[PDB]
């Protein structure tokens, strides 16, 4: 039967429901773009730049080691990369 | 006893598939 | 004592025979190698 | 007729918001020089 | 078809070493260690069998 | 409720989705991730 | 009439996505869980856990990408945003493999949830319950292999990584340590899964075949109303082609559709014993009357005793990186080679 | 004393609560606005 | 000796094996794809040892 | 049916099949004990997982 | 007729001869108690507790005898090592034969209330068929639980009218039975307090009695009772199923990791103290402190007790089994006789090497031995052609101080590299491999089994309760659906409730 | 080979056992009406 | 700090575009059900 | 002590096979009228 909702097939097809979204979608996209061509995506989440893995001379993992001072062992990490 | 053993087991499923096909129940419809 | 109303009789017709005897039969020739080890 | 914010509205926005958002955003990352 | 396909060594996607930093340290993947357990089971196999440095069959 | 055909959407977002995922296609040989 | 009563209508409602008192513990695990997945493989890296790059941002495609397991040292901590690894804070929570537990933990109460949901409805509907017992695989599955097996060995390390090279990776860590193929329980679990593929084949293809002709059209499809009382396709009939072809044929259609859930479901579950067993490294690896012969026998050799020197290779050569806590350095003169390769 | 870890526990469990609280509080509002006819 | 290398592979129940070991080993690295029926050997002992059976099952 | 001396001296306790206590009864009390006892198995979970360290206790060996 | 999967069932309606079954239940886990303890007996050796303790040799129930205070046998011995001591009559052979005669006496029972099985008391006055109180039942049979829980952890653990528990030292050297006193601030919820153990069962000896007054004297809910079924017996099933599991689970991961109630000098070392070089570090620790205080080399690991250094042996590792490697671990390795001393690598430059031990993960670990910094320095290679590290080459020797090789070293490679492959898994030790037939195959310790075998009951009894839950609730479509049933019902929006005609 | 000498009766049994439980329960139902 | 500004603005307008277009059809849903 | 090592399936057997020949027997006895 029917639930009472308005079917997808005329939503869809609806001039009204694209004005709204002709606007609506590309801003997100944009949003989205502007996520990471901004660089705060590297800085949200702590990823790694191309140039932020490895010091100049360095060749070993910065591996995490203790459990409860792992918080205070990245920062070090990131810190002897200037 | 390990080769008496296997072999033994390997005749009873074969033998367990003659009686299956050729003695099974009869299916009659109704 | 007066008989239990409870009883119930039991069944096992030919194809669970059939079906019975193949499961143990090939639980046997896959754990046979090893219980001998 | 019908009505326009139902329970069915916000299950479609709650994945579709997201998602177009992350479809730019792995799109930028393909011109990710190194 | 797959199996009937890598029969004539078209083989799976290859992302060894496929990540690599803005100096050209390879930056290993889940990819990379995939290949370290193929490379253990590939010096082992048929260890008498081969007398020269590639297994091209 | 139909002012625009379906089957004129239905090409639309099928020639939108070709595209994006093309794109990323195309990124596996430039930029990151392109062993180069 | 008071206010229990009240939201108890609500939330069985028949609407277009059923909600039900199941929903409450159900869609927020489920959203967070797949969302936390989403969010990981797009943005988050694996680089001082593990030594890995793991996200889009970084490089990594659809079948490199992964939310890697929390480091080794961490230990079997819950790893909770508020607790005393993260201490607060957001970026050094996904630093340290926060994400994983995340997935994990809101993906175990979310399984929990939807089977809560097939004994909500199947009850509003009034049908048994067969479709969530029938679930009971899937979950003991996913709780033996993400939870029971990390939980025995030393961290949440040796879990799977939710990524698609991250499992193929987790399969042949099972072969170079714990020859998981030779494991009788993994045999029956094949067995489960095989021959449900069989089944589901054999059935549809026999229906397929066996149907009666009550259309005109050469695409018989719309020569079906849900609302018969007959059967669409000839049960006899099907009975005399398999007792030909194959020597027996099923006769019953109640014990043909139960057979269909036994054969998969309970497949599943012997899977799973296996993996219980594997977390305290109760293996099959060996059989010790073949050991004892060959160690004595240079000339006896069978094909488990080359499939040993290839387990004996996969650990060699595959543990100092898929292990780096543990920092091994093996030189060239000590990793088993064969000749020449 | 209360070690940094059992604030975190504190902060958690009332974190906890809220949703919970502001998780229901909605739906039993929706749920009276929003009866159902016999 | 499936790897046409001398080196013979035990394979049946008799001379040492169980049903998970167990197997009919393939014809050896020698014979390649060349058709090797009983009657292209000198006899069955030969035939049995270079992997015959397999080909004909 | 048939009786026994002690089959008589525990009649009232097997003699009240089927009666309940009107409406909700105590089940507001119940779940709040539910709660209770949550936050209890909770603490000592984490306790036992070191996530919660308390000043004093020690999960270890050398306790 | 009844198929084979339901010939129970006869048991649902019929309460006297479900007590029957209930009976002959417990008479068979009772009389398997009696024969598994007096079959220990006569296959254990009491002459060594030091290398060959209990869980060396397959004990299963022994341990858990010693864990409450039964320490001593009629014939004059205890596992703690002394002679000559009267145990009375509660020794094993006394709580052996107890469950014995036990069972004997549970199966006359069940005979009685099988045959006698049409009772007034199981008779519902008003109605006359047969009926259960199951409400006021839990109430009672929880009231007895918190008195036995109560005076459990009263009198029995506490030493005012018992023997105690099992405690020992951090590193499992110098067990006792002794008296615990009850912790009731917060280190009694440390899994590793003993006074938790007691403090609980006393706390929640007095709930458990609270609680039984309260379910006793005040009726159930009516919307709780039809919610639950309370009138179906069934009910009890699917939840009591849910707390043994609930349970199973926990004794499982406690035995793993380890607490109080799991000794070490009971069910053997745990996994996790080998990796974090737990006894390695205490071993190092004593040999510190006896350098430091002016004694020899040999005099400082001489001072080392050979059950602290067997401890640090990676064949009592319950992570080093096998699935059909059945029996004892005496089998494997041998019967442990002697400690043959703490073994020192050196090259010919004089620096001390050191060889890294195998995780629990490899079946098979290569020999490669460092310095005191992580650098490579000796192994045995495995291609010759371009060997750099080899013994030979780097001219590697092994002294050995305490023990029964005190003093000596040897230099010759053949035997320099026999005992580097030992010294992967740990200290060395000598075995007697042919009283057993051993065959030199690791096998897990009784706490290894006792987990494997508790967390897979605890997985399939989950199924247990999912099916015997579901049972309680679908009792009505147990046997199909209604052969009526109106499409309007589940027609989609047709009512505004799922499956309420009240609400078109 | 050096097998485990229970593994014979331990297979043995592990046949026999169940095998006559279902033939017991078969004999006696052909043997009803 | 400025980055999440630019990041977060798009979705305002979008939103407030898509609102601007939808309460006329918006306040028509609540005053029905009630 | 060194006893034969098939005493025990040729005892174990000796027991377990005609008992279950008797018990087949019975069972399906009691079963008919
Ligand atoms: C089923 C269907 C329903 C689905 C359920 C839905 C899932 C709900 C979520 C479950 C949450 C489980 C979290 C378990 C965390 C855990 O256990 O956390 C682990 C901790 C133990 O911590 C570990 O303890 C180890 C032992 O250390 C000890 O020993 C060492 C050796 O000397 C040192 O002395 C050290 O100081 C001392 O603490 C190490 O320290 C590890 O680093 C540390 O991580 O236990 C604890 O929190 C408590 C453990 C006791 C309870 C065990 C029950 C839970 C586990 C059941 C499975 C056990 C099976 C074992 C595998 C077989
Ligand atoms: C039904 C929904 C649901 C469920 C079951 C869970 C379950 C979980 N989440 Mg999740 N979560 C949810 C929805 C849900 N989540 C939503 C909607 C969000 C978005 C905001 C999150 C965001 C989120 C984050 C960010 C994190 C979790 C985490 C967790 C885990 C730990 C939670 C915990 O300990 O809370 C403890 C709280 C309780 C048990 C509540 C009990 C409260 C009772 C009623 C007592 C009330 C106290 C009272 C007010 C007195 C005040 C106390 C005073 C003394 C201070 C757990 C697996 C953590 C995790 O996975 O880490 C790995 C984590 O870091 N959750
Ligand atoms: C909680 C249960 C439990 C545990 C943990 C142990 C643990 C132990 N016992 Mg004990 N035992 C038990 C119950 C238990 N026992 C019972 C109930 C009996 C009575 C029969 C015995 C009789 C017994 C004897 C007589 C002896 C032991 C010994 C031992 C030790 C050796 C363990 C071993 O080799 O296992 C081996 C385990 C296996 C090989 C695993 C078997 C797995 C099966 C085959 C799987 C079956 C699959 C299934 C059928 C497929 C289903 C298919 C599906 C489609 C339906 C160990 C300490 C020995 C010892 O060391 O004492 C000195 C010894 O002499 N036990
Ligand atoms: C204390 C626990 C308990 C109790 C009292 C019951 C009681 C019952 N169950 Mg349930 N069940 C349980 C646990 C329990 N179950 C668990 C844990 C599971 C999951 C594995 C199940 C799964 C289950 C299913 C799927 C079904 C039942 C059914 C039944 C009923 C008939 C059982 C019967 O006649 O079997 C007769 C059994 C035999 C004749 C032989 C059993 C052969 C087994 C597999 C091998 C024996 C092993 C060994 C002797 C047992 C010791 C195990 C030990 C280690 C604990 C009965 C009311 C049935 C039902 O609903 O009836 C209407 C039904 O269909 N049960
Ligand atoms: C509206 C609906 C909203 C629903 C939301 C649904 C949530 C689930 C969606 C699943 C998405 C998971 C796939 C993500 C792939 C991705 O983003 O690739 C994004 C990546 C981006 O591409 C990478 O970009 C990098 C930039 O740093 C580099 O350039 C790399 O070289 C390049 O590979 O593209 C691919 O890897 C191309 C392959 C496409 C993968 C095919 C997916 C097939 C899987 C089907 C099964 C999924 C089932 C879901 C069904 C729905
Ligand atoms: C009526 C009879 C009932 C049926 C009898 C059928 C018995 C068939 C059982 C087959 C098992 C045999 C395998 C062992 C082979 C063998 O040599 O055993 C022999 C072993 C004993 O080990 C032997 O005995 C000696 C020890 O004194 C020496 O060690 C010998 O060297 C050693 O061979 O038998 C046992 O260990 C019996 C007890 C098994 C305890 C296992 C408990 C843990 C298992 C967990 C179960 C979970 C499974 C869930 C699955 C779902
Ligand atoms: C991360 C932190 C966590 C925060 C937690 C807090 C968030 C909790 C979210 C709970 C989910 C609530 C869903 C409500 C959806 C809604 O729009 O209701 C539907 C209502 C009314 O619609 C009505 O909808 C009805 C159909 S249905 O119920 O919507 O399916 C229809 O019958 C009726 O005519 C119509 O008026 O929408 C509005 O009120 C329009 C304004
Ligand atoms: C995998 C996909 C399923 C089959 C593919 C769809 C068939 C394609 C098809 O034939 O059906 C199309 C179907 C019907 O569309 P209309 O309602 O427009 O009907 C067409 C005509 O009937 C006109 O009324 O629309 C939907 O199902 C849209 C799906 C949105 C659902 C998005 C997800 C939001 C809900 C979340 C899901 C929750 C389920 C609960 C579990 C947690
Ligand atoms: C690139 C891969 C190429 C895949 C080709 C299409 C797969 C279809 C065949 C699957 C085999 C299934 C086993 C038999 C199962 C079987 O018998 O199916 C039969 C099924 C029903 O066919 P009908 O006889 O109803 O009509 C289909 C034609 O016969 C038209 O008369 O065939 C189709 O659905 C064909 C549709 C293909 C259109 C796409
Ligand atoms: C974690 C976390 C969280 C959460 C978050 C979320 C919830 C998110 C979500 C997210 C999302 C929700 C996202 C989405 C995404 C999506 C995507 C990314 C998609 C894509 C796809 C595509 C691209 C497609 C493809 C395809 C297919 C599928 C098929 C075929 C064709 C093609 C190829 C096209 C929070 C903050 C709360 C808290 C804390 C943390
Ligand atoms: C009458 C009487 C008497 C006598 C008694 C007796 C003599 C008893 C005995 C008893 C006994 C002596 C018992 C036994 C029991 C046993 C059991 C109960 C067992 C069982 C087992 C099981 C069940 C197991 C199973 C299994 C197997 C086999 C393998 C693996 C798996 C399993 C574990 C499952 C007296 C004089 C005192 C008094 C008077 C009266
Ligand atoms: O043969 Mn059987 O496996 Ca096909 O690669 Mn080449 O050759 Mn042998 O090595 Mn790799
Ligand atoms: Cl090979
Ligand atoms: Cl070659």
């Known amino acids: 039967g029917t639930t009472g909702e308005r079917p997808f097939s005329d939503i869809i097809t609806s001039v009204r429901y694209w004005v709204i979204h002709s606007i609506t979608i590309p801003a997100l996209f944009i949003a989205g773009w502007l996520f990471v061509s901004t660089g705060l995506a590297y800085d949200v989440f702590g990823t790694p730049r191309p140039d932020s893995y490895y010091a100049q001379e360095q060749r070993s993992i910065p591996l995490v080691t203790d459990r409860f001072e792992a918080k205070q062992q990245v920062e070090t990490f990131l810190e002897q990369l200037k | 006893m390990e080769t008496i053993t296997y072999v033994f087991i390997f005749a009873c499923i074969i033998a367990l598939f003659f009686f299956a096909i050729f003695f099974r129940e009869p299916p009659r419809i109704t | ?37 | ?34 | ?57 | 409720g139909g002012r625009i055909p379906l089957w004129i959407v239905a090409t639309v977002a099928g020639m939108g989705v070709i595209v994006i995922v093309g794109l990323f296609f195309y990124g596996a040989y430039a930029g990151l991730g392109s062993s180069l | 009439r008071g206010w229990f009563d009240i939201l108890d209508d609500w939330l069985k409602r028949d609407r277009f996505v059923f909600v039900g008192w199941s929903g409450i513990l159900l869609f927020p695990c489920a959203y967070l869980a797949l969302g936390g997945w989403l969010t990981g493989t797009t943005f988050v890296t694996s680089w001082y856990t593990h030594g890995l790059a793991s996200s889009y941002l970084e490089g990594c495609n659809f079948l490199t990408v992964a939310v890697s397991t929390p480091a080794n040292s961490m230990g079997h901590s819950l790893l909770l945003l508020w607790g005393p690894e993260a201490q607060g804070d957001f970026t050094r929570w996904c630093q340290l493999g926060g994400l994983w537990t995340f997935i994990a933990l809101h993906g175990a109460f979310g399984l929990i949830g939807f089977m809560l949901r097939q004994f909500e409805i199947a009850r509003l509907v009034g049908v048994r319950p067969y479709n969530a017992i029938a679930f009971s695989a899937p979950i003991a599955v996913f709780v033996s292999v993400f939870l029971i097996y990390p939980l025995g060995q030393s961290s949440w390390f040796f879990a799977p990584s939710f990524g698609v090279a991250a499992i193929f990776r987790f399969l042949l860590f099972f072969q170079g340590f714990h020859n998981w193929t030779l494991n009788p329980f993994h045999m029956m679990g094949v067995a489960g899964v095989l021959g449900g593929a069989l089944l589901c084949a054999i059935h549809g293809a026999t229906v397929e075949n066996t149907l009666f002709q009550d259309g005109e059209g050469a695409s018989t499809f719309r020569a079906f109303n849900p609302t018969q009382a007959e059967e669409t396709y000839s049960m006899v009939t099907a009975n005399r082609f398999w007792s030909q072809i194959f020597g027996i044929a099923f006769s019953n259609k109640r014990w043909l559709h139960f057979f269909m859930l036994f054969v998969p479901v309970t497949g599943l579950w012997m899977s799973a014993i296996g993996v219980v067993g594997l977390a305290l490294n109760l293996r099959s690896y060996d059989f010790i009357s073949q050991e004892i012969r060959a160690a004595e026998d240079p000339e006896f050799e069978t094909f488990y005793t080359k499939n040993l020197l290839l387990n004996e290779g996969i650990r060699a050569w595959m543990a100092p990186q898929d292990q780096p806590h543990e920092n091994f350095v093996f030189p060239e003169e000590v990793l088993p080679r064969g000749n020449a390769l | ?38 | ?57 | 049916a048939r009786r026994t001396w002690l089959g008589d001296i525990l009649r009232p306790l097997n003699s009240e099949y089927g009666k309940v206590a009107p409406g909700w009864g105590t089940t507001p009390l119940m779940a709040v004990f539910m709660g209770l006892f949550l936050v209890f198995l909770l603490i000592i979970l984490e306790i036992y997982n070191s996530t919660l360290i308390l000043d004093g206790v020690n999960v270890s060996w050398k306790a | 007729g009844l198929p084979w999967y339901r010939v129970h069932t006869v048991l649902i309606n019929d309460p006297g001869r479900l007590i029957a079954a209930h009976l002959m239940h417990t008479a068979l886990v009772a009389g398997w108690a009696g024969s598994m303890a007096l079959y220990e007996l006569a296959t254990f050796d009491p002459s060594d507790p030091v290398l060959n303790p209990m869980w060396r040799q397959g004990m299963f129930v022994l341990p858990f005898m010693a864990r409450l205070g039964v320490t001593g046998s009629w014939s004059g011995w205890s596992i703690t090592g002394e002679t000559g001591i009267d145990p009375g009559f509660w020794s094993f052979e006394g709580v052996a034969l107890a469950h014995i005669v036990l069972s004997g006496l549970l199966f006359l029972a069940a005979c009685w209330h099988w045959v006698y099985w049409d009772l007034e008391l199981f008779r519902d006055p008003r109605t006359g068929e047969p009926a259960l109180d199951l409400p006021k039942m839990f109430g009672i049979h929880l009231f007895l639980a918190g008195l036995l829980c109560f005076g459990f952890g009263a009198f029995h653990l506490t030493g005012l009218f018992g023997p105690g528990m099992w405690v020992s030292d951090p590193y499992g050297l110098t067990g006792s039975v002794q008296p615990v006193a009850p912790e009731w601030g917060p280190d009694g919820f440390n899994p590793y307090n003993p006074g938790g153990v007691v403090a609980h069962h006393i706390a929640a000896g007095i709930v458990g009695i609270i609680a039984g007054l309260f379910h006793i004297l005040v009726r159930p809910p009516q919307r709780l009772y039809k919610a639950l079924r309370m009138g179906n017996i069934e009910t009890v099933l699917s939840s009591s199923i849910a707390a043994v599991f609930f349970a199973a689970f926990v004794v499982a991961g406690t035995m793993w990791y380890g607490s109080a109630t799991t000794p070490i000098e009971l069910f053997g070392p745990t996994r996790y103290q080998w990796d974090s070089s737990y006894f390695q570090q205490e071993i190092n620790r004593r040999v510190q402190a006896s350098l430091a205080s002016g004694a020899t080399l040999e005099e400082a690991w001489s001072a080392i007790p050979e059950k602290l250094a067997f401890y640090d042996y990676i064949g009592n590792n319950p992570a080093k089994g096998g699935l059909f490697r059945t029996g004892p671990m005496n089998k494997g390795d041998g019967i442990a006789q002697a400690w043959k001393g703490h073994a020192v690598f050196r090259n010919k430059e004089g620096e001390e090497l050191f060889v890294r031990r195998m995780p629990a993960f490899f079946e098979s670990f290569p020999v490669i031995l460092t310095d005191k910094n992580g650098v490579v320095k000796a192994d045995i290679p495995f291609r010759r052609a371009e060997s750099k590290y080899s013994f030979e080459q780097q001219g590697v020797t092994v002294s050995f101080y305490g023990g029964e090789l005190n003093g000596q070293t040897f230099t010759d490679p053949p035997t320099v590299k026999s005992y580097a492959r030992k010294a992967i898994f740990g200290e060395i030790f000598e075995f007697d491999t042919e009283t057993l037939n051993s065959d030199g195959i690791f096998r897990t310790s009784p706490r290894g089994w006792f987990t494997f075998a508790h967390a897979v009951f605890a997985l399939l009894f989950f199924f247990g309760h999912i099916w015997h839950g579901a049972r309680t609730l679908f009792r009505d479509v147990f046997s199909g659906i209604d052969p009526e049933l109106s499409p309007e019902q589940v027609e989609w929006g047709f009512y505004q409730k799922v499956g309420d005609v009240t609400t078109r | ?33 | ?34």
Request: glycine share 6%; proline share 5%; charged share 10%.
């Open chain 9, 1 to 57: 000796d499936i790897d046409g290398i001398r080196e013979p592979v035990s394979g049946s129940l008799l001379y040492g094996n169980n049903i998970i070991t167990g197997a009919v080993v393939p014809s050896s690295n020698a014979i390649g794809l060349h058709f090797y029926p009983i009657w292209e050997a000198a006899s069955l002992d030969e035939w049995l040892y270079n992997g015959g059976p397999y080909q004909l099952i």
């Open chain 13, 1 to 34: 700090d400025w980055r999440v500004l630019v990041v977060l603005l798009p979705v305002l307008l979008a939103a407030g575009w898509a609102v601007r277009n939808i309460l006329p059809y918006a306040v028509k849903q609540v005053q029905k059900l009630l």
């Open chain 8, 1 to 38: 004393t209360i070690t940094p870890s059992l604030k975190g526990f504190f902060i958690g469990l009332l974190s906890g609560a809220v949703v919970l609280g502001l998780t229901f509080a909605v739906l039993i509002a929706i749920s009276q606005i929003d009866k159902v006819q016999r």
């Open chain 3, 1 to 37: 004592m007066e008989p239990n109303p409870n009883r119930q009789p039991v069944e096992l017709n030919r194809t669970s025979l059939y079906l019975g005897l193949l499961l143990i039969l090939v639980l046997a020739l896959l754990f046979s190698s090893y219980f001998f080890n």
């Open chain 12, 1 to 33: 080979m050096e097998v485990n000498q229970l593994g014979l009766i331990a297979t043995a049994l592990f046949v026999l056992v169940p095998s006559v439980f279902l033939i017991i329960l078969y004999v006696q139902t052909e043997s009803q009406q």
């Open chain 5, 1 to 57: 078809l797959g199996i009937s396909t890598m029969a004539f060594n078209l083989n799976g996607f290859n992302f060894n070493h496929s990540v690599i930093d803005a100096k050209g340290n390879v930056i290993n993947t889940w990819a990379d260690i995939i290949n370290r357990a193929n490379l253990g089971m590939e010096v082992m196999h048929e260890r008498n069998a081969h007398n020269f440095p590639l297994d091209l069959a």
């Open chain 4, 1 to 34: 007729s019908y009505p326009i914010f139902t329970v069915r509205w916000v299950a479609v926005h709650t994945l579709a918001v997201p998602t177009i958002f992350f479809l730019g955003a792995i799109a930028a990352m393909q011109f990710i020089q190194r």
